[PDB]
């Protein structure tokens, strides 16, 4: 099913790309392109071994050698390839939880479309690397019912894929259906309930089921009846029940789409998602932006930067 454009280089030699990568930082200058052109064609799981080579054989950190020789974009991307895959979303959270302006954008981004196996391996790792709880710090920064989302999602409890109860799909559209737009007000509490434990199956009937009682796709009425933070949440936790690829693929557009670019988001996707789906997530970019991803970041990013980014993604067609 889901295919992600790098992959384990078959010739690997982790020693010989060690002293690949000394080469291109000895001395003055470096050769930028040397180190774009080896790191983007490895697995991250060699990029590790790749490091620990380094050190036995130079006594130096890669990462930190790289820090002090690289600079700009083009060095926060080189940082990011060589996080441990395992790591990554952990460290994105941290980064976005160091709350004293948490930046819940990353927060409804990683906690949506990451699926329950996924959020208990983060948690884990978490707490191993920065000795703090995930749950604690997010309810630390976050309030009201987007808090309480977060933190539903966050016990990665979601129902199992089983056979399709229709009387219990019919149950659920006509819930949400009276928690919303036939109630003066919202019931937050009861969509919070549904969308966050429900099975990606049952769920994506009870979209179709209440389009047809309602009239109203489930994402008009969340826009009707939400806002800020909840709203957001909850359409992002609705996009990626419908397609974790299509939500990503348009987090991505939007973060090109407008003046200039969303690096961080842009970087965070394309690197996180490298080894899962972004062949996938291409497909569905193409299919509806009209665009190639491709296209899009080569036209948008610069320099070097531009080319390491063009090279894990790949695909001009797509
Ligand atoms: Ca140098
Ligand atoms: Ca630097
Ligand atoms: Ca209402
Ligand atoms: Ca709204
Ligand atoms: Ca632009």
Redesign the pocket.
Known sequence: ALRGTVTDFSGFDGRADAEVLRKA??????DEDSILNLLTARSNAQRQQIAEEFKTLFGRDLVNDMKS?LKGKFEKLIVALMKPSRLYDAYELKHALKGAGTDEKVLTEIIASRTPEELRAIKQAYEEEYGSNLEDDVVGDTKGYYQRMLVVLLQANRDPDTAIDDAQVELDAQALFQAGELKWGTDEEKFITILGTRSVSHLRRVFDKYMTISGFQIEETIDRETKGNLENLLLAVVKSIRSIPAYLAETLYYAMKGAGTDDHTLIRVIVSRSEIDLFNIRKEFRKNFATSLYSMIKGDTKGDYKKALLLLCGGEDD
């Open positions: 930082m000895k001395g003055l200058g470096t020789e």
